[PDB]
Design a protein around this nucleic acid. Structure first.
Ligand SMILES: [Mg+2]
Ligand SMILES: [Mg+2]
Lengths: 163, 163
DNA sequence: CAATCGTAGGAGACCTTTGGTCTCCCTGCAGAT
DNA sequence: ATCTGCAGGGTCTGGTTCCAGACCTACGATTG
């Protein structure tokens, strides 16, 4: 049936797969906010809830979400932001009636044979373009790898196979 | 005029103040989760949303929430968990129809004259007991300071004053 | 169960398989074209 | 604007133009 895949971080996206084969992918809504006298991007909570409420996916649809797992060498702001983005998305999905299933990036990458790639973000856009050819135009920029990763997480959840 | 005050961390609480002067305070629901082969406490998303849905406070009620601000010397896990709990609560409150207003701890502490105390958690329980005497029995343990801080945040938002 | 103390910390999936091995980002800021 | 590269970082309020002063939290463990 329906499958949702969420790539939750600031350059992420939510992909929605319908039973008739169609797909949608939306960039994560964000806002600019002032923190410690500089500008930071933060997810836009109201817009995410509005987006989820507008989906045709019925209550109980599984929403796969990529599990938050920053490196010990990443900065503490990286740790805070990945936690924040994860919590915001999990509560939004639960409140909107979806069944949240966290998935490690290694899981869907291994499924599509994408591990240890020299060009992982390019490879993600290529794989997503082949699985979802009507999204090829929406994946033409390097910055679209977040869209590709959400689509691939959803594709994993739906059991799709590359040709 | 209803007022909600949320102390969002793992030992926190949500306080609800009604226009008739009554109050409720609920410990934050949590679950035990496995992470890196050890047990960690994490907020319980479903129980938080269920709790919010059961409140009598009408949509549009303001929910003051204590702003997340860990120290630079706190560990990266502390940074992740304060971010996660903050995001989970913000999305839960917005999805439940409440108007979220972040408040720094310094703001409500200064308002009640609590800064630079030798016993800050005891003083919070004492101040909350004086503002909400029918919660005195619910504030008598040292571990109840999370409840006290949620009540004081709500009291700040309502404009209450100590005698 | 409740209180207290002290430092500030990866996490996850699958193999080699009851421990071992290998994998994975993310943010924040500056720069160039 | 899009991309690229590199290191891994506090933040907030009241008082102004930056300063001064203030604030936790988590994750372990132990003791009764
Ligand atoms: Mg991502
Ligand atoms: Mg707190």
């Amino acid at each position: 049936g329906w499958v949702i895949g969420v790539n939750p971080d600031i350059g992420g996206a939510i992909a929605v797969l319908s039973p008739d084969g169609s797909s949608q992918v939306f960039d994560n809504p964000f806002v600019h906010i002032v923190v410690s006298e500089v500008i930071r991007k933060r997810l836009d909570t109201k817009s995410i809830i509005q987006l989820l409420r507008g989906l045709d996916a019925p209550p109980g649809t599984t929403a796969y979400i990529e599990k938050s797992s920053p490196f010990p060498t990443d900065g503490k702001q990286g740790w805070w932001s990945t936690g924040f983005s994860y919590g915001l998305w999990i509560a939004s999905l639960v409140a909107s009636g979806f069944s949240v299933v966290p998935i490690a990036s290694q899981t869907w990458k291994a499924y599509f044979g994408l591990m240890r790639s020299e060009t992982p973000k390019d490879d993600s856009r290529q794989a997503a373009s082949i699985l979802f050819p009507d999204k090829d135009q929406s994946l033409k920029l390097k910055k679209h790898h977040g869209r590709a990763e959400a689509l691939l997480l959803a594709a994993y959840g739906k059991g799709l196979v590359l040709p």
